[PDB]
Design a protein around this ligand. Structure first.
Ligand code: NAG
Lengths: 48, 24
């Protein structure tokens, strides 16, 4: 479910927030996202 | 056979340490 505050457990990564589509350029080996503050920003969907 | 001539490396041989996307 996207655009709605939910609890996610993406591949064991637990957390809460809102998810949606993106226009990133995740390299094929990339799996996570972050910022200069080292906070999980983007998660690649395991089944999508 | 083979040789063992030595050269310089310059800025080369840097790999993505993790699989965490980052930008700017
Ligand atoms: C996940 O598995 C199902 C069943 O094998 C398959 O139909 C689907 O395409 C798979 N999705 C991915 C992203 O591999």
């Amino acid at each position: 479910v996207k655009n709605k505050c939910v609890n996610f457990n993406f591949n064991g990564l637990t957390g809460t927030g809102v998810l949606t589509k993106s226009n990133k350029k995740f390299l094929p080996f990339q799996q996570f996202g972050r910022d200069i503050v080292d906070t999980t920003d983007a998660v690649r969907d395991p089944q999508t | 056979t083979t040789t063992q001539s030595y050269t310089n490396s310059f800025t080369r041989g840097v790999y993505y340490p993790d699989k965490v996307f980052r930008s700017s």
